């Protein structure tokens, strides 16, 4: 099943997650991504922050070559790291990415987070007392050449990771924009359901992408292990024994029936080969309601080390 992005394109509405935790080895994406591919995950996410660019591609070309798939048959993303939002620093990272991937061009090409860093090799720079060194980038200015990527034809469509809504309307209202970003890729589930955000986007022709769509890798310290963990919620597990299913996919469901492309991380052959089967079962309305009373507040990856810079995404409403 596919969405009809404000570029024309189309993109698959289940998508297989590629972060994992620093502590699991590379080598991991590897065989976890050939698995996605065979279950049927046609729509894979990864950028250069995840370090795992040459296995994800290793594996897509695999499944290309043994012929189980054509490229055209898989849609796959790329995102832009916070230290090459300089706009000539642009192209020469989506370059990098895809001379590791072995692939001419991506599907998809976001601008990861709004906050810029330091350029240089290091994903997170600090100065010798660990301090953060964050750059002063105009985000119009990075998204224009995002642009130029795309008239390159080395990314087929661009957009979003989170911004708010603030940050989509500064790119909207920019004079003489060229392609509105396809989507916003943000934090979604049933805790944090992201209403007001879902709604703007719409509004905007812009697809919310939603991912920790599972609750999240719960990787430290990156998300607070006394946050609940949205995979035990009681009422998710009521609705999974109901339908003969797990709690992950009610939560994949819920994001499919409210209008959200969906991401699933998984590592683990049986969670691989269970997550593509959200499309075999649907919830009621009553059912959709019952999900939309469980949000709370709460926000898995909060990235406030990022916090400080003015483009700090979460201080907003939304
Ligand atoms: N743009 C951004 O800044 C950003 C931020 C976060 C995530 N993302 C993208 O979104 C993807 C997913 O988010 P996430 O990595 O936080 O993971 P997630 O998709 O929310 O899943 C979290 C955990 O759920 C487990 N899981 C998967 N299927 C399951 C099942 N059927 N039953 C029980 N548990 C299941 C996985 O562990 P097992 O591997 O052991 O199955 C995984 O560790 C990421 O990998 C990344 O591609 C993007
Ligand atoms: O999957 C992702 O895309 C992701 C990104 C960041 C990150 C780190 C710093 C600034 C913005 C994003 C951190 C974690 Cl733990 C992630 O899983
Ligand atoms: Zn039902």
Known sequence: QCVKLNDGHFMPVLGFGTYAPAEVPKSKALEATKLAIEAGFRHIDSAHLYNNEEQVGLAIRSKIADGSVKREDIFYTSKLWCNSHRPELVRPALERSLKNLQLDYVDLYLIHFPVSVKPGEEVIP?????????????????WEAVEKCKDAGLAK??????????????????????????????????????????????????????????GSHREEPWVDPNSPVLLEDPVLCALAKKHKRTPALIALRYQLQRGVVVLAKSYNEQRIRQNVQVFEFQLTSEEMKAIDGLNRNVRYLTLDIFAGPPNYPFSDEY
Not at 126 to 142: P, R, S
Not at 177 to 197: A, I
């Open 126 to 142: 600090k100065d010798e007392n660990g301090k953060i060194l964050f750059d002063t980038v105009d985000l119009c200015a990075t």
């Open 157 to 214: 469509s661009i957009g979003v990771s989170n911004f708010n809504r603030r940050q989509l309307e500064m790119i909207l209202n920019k004079p003489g924009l060229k392609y509105k970003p396809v989507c916003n890729q943000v934090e979604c589930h049933p805790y944090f359901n992201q209403r007001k955000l879902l709604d703007f986007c719409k509004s905007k022709d812009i697809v919310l992408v939603a991912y920790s769509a599972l």
